[PDB]
Amino acid sequence: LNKELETLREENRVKSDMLKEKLSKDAENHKAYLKSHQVHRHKLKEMEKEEPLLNEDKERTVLFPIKYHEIWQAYKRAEASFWTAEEIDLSKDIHDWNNRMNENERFFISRVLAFFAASENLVENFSTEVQIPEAKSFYGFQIMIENIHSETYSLLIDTYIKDPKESEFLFNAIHTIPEIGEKAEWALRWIQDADALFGERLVAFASIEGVFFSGSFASIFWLKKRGMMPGLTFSNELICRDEGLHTDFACLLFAHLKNKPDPAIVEKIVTEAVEIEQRYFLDALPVALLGMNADLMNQYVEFVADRLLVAFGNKKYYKVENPFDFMEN
Template identity: 35%
Template structure:
């Protein structure tokens, strides 16, 4: 059994004749099953916090969006069509990586509790995006094309190929046996957290809140508020896993790994900028490729700083509606849920990674 971190129900020490427990690191091969004594209580608390934030797709009212869609210009309809096509596949990539890689290699029952909860949340997101497609694209042929976006929309295909380049190298590993395996896993996890959930989805959220800032698609924005909070928590958990591994095995984090992560973020910005060119075309009022470039570079620098690396872009956020998103909408989210749910939400909200 591993050594314990003291908590409120710490078990008695093992008898001396049982020997000294083996100290395991988070990425050591194996499948720890025992939650007491608890080694990683912070992961368990994250699981408990996630349970408090349960929401369902049936609570999102998209009826007003149908009228709004009829008011959009052809360029705006193109943007929203591409956006929901990305949503249709993005969370499926995340869910597959959770099951095939993260759950297998993060050797902590507390962390696996959280990952199990995260998988449920990703399923809710997929259902939400399915509902969006059914509502926004009434033509079955259009819906089928959106679900096949990875194959037939170049800008979405490029984002998917980026994910596979950085994440697939550990899918077939049964165990992380050596330093090289663990570094490959870390690159997978950082791509998952910083690039997919922390950049691709944050870019998508900006388009949603741009529509909302103009009084459009409030149903989409409501559901996105809750997805936004889930994704922020997913990213925060993944970064805490990285922090834990860094404390336990600091030799894994050298200049070479830092250079790889920086190159990864640069590639992610380039892929997402290609998507922005597709969505924005020649530009829309308050939304164009140049403003999205600045926004994406600003977010990418935030992710690099969170990982202990130097920022590389030094751009400022051009979207004031994203600056307000974390405080205003998440506050409203909690106010609604205290009266609408059987389990009231308690505690505080951390907004460190917002926009």
């Protein structure tokens, strides 16, 4: 019952709040920062109008001579990976859901799906900006391929849970998770607020594809090890692959930026993400529920962020290592 859940959250109530606190005074620490940099950020955001990645090269309509090979190469690498939800064999799955997965497992996973099927930016704040065809291609496909992800998670939810009676409780007891709110505030902070430099939004976006969900991906690769939910594992593999292709791209584009953000920010955006992500599992879904070690999970998310930081130019802040070998890929 909720009993164990309680014990489990309890074991990680201390660490949770250590974070739950360590975020709060970030809504302020921010107002503080911006307040005293009103002048500086103006200069940057003003020079923004001069980043090649952000201005049309009207000396071009040929629409081929490949100027940005590195980018293009990213488009092709992803155009070549197209896949639909109907390639997902979901047969042995329904079986393992009732005769192999215990009560604890049928819970963790159900919730982790409900998460995926919940979480404008890509299009309206990025695909619109960026004046190089090479990149627009990548983004278009990114938006298109992410819509297939969305279909997938629902198909899945809709395959395993056949009693909407539950499916309903499920989604009700999912919008009370303090993490959603916190994630929300994390976003209004670096993304939805104007006067928010492009380069900073790139770090926040890559953090959404590369950090804000690395915890669920691995949790599902764990089910692969104990050979189960074959269909899920398969979709969960293609998706992860994808969100990686996507994260890497942000990095690649960051690189073309001339006026990059202050390393401090790059590190702080990522960092605040990690903390909300770890807090996902030391509060809402305990990885213990499916045989995982909370300490190692926390450690992975840190690894993942660390990895991203280096991709961005900053330096490993965590300095932890890959606590999982099945995520070696």
